[PDB]
Design an enzyme around this catalytic site. Structure first.
Site, mmCIF file in Angstrom:
data_model
loop_
_atom_site.group_PDB
_atom_site.id
_atom_site.type_symbol
_atom_site.label_atom_id
_atom_site.label_comp_id
_atom_site.label_asym_id
_atom_site.label_seq_id
_atom_site.Cartn_x
_atom_site.Cartn_y
_atom_site.Cartn_z
ATOM 1 N N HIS A 40 0.816 -1.217 0.000
ATOM 2 C CA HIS A 40 0.000 0.000 0.000
ATOM 3 C C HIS A 40 0.856 1.277 0.000
ATOM 4 O O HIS A 40 0.321 2.382 -0.149
ATOM 5 C CB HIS A 40 -1.028 -0.007 1.134
ATOM 6 N N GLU A 52 18.990 7.679 8.075
ATOM 7 C CA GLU A 52 18.236 8.835 8.567
ATOM 8 C C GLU A 52 17.973 8.793 10.064
ATOM 9 O O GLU A 52 17.653 7.744 10.621
ATOM 10 C CB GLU A 52 16.872 8.920 7.869
ATOM 11 N N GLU A 62 23.427 10.016 5.972
ATOM 12 C CA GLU A 62 22.435 9.615 4.982
ATOM 13 C C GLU A 62 23.045 9.080 3.693
ATOM 14 O O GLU A 62 24.128 9.497 3.275
ATOM 15 C CB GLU A 62 21.524 10.786 4.603
ATOM 16 N N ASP A 84 0.113 -7.643 1.916
ATOM 17 C CA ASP A 84 0.567 -6.248 1.899
ATOM 18 C C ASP A 84 2.089 -6.167 2.020
ATOM 19 O O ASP A 84 2.647 -5.835 3.078
ATOM 20 C CB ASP A 84 -0.129 -5.447 3.004
ATOM 21 N N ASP A 171 1.138 2.170 19.899
ATOM 22 C CA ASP A 171 0.824 1.611 18.580
ATOM 23 C C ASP A 171 1.654 2.301 17.497
ATOM 24 O O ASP A 171 2.213 3.371 17.727
ATOM 25 C CB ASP A 171 -0.675 1.839 18.305
ATOM 26 N N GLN A 174 -0.326 6.219 11.105
ATOM 27 C CA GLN A 174 -0.123 6.768 9.796
ATOM 28 C C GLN A 174 1.290 7.331 9.624
ATOM 29 O O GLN A 174 1.723 8.047 10.445
ATOM 30 C CB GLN A 174 -1.162 7.842 9.543
ATOM 31 N N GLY A 175 1.949 6.973 8.528
ATOM 32 C CA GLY A 175 3.319 7.417 8.286
ATOM 33 C C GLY A 175 4.356 6.390 8.700
ATOM 34 O O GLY A 175 5.489 6.444 8.230
ATOM 35 N N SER A 177 3.623 3.249 8.127
ATOM 36 C CA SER A 177 3.324 2.283 7.076
ATOM 37 C C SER A 177 4.549 1.816 6.329
ATOM 38 O O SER A 177 5.363 2.632 5.897
ATOM 39 C CB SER A 177 2.392 2.912 6.046
ATOM 40 N N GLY A 178 4.663 0.504 6.166
ATOM 41 C CA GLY A 178 5.756 -0.082 5.409
ATOM 42 C C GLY A 178 6.996 -0.352 6.239
ATOM 43 O O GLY A 178 7.906 -1.034 5.781
HETATM 44 CA CA CA Z 1 18.487 13.477 7.865
#
Ligand code: CA
Length: 223
Positions: A40, A52, A62, A84, A171, A174-175, A177-178
């Site tokens: 998704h 990061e 980075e 997913d 928990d 949102q964000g 995800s993945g």
């Molecule tokens: Ca950075």
């Protein structure tokens, strides 16, 4: 991550940010040129950002590498979120070091009760909205299949597991995800879905990575 803690810079070296002008999903580095994320999270024009901590500031560790291809699982259903999972190949191999490192795939599935580490740059509020700049972490146990199914009648497939706290307050969100769920040094889950965030009796639901190891290995071997 709601109810978590600040991980510390580069303490989760397999955690990646997927960026298309802005952070939109997490992912996990599984070797020098491949990332595992949620299906998704699929879109075109993905840059993978490794090493990061603060995603808004260039801090010196980075590596920014464009994706050359994405492979969504052949059986991904976006309505049910069954299967997913997606693979992302980097245009060039990441330089691996103490702060940018791959995470091992499971050799077997993790059991209910196993403690895991969930991480990401997602929302930190269960009602409001606040996005952190630095990576957030949460220690959370895998929940029983029965409690997961009871929490989400009719929605939990054999390719999903619940992790977190039925009492609420802690928990992914949102964000996130993945992003990774890592247990005893193995990638066992991918942040997939949930009803709101950190709500009572609505734990996080995660893609069951151990079901996909053969697909991951074979896909990597021919792409
Ligand atoms: Ca950075």
């Amino acid at each position: 991550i709601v109810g978590g803690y600040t991980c510390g810079a580069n303490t989760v070296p397999y955690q990646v940010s997927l960026n298309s002008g802005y952070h939109f999903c997490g992912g996990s580095l599984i070797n020098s040129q491949w990332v595992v994320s949620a299906a998704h999270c699929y879109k075109s024009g993905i840059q993978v950002r490794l090493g990061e901590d603060n995603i808004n500031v260039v801090e010196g560790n980075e590596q920014f590498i464009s994706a050359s291809k994405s492979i969504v699982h052949p059986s991904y259903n976006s309505n049910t979120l069954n299967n997913d999972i997606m693979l992302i190949k980097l245009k060039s191999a990441a330089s691996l070091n103490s702060r940018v490192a791959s995470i091992s795939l499971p050799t077997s599935c993790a059991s209910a009760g196993t403690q895991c580490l969930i991480s990401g740059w997602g929302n930190t509020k269960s009602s409001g909205t606040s996005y952190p700049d630095v990576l957030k972490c949460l220690k959370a146990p895998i929940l029983s299949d029965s409690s997961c199914k009871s929490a989400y009648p009719g929605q939990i497939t054999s390719n999903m597991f619940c992790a977190g706290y039925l009492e609420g307050g802690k928990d992914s969100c949102q964000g996130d995800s993945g992003g990774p769920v890592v247990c005893s040094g193995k990638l066992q889950g991918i942040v997939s879905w949930g009803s709101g965030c950190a709500q009572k009796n609505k734990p996080g639901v995660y893609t069951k990575v151990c079901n996909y190891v053969s697909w991951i290995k074979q896909t990597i071997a021919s792409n």
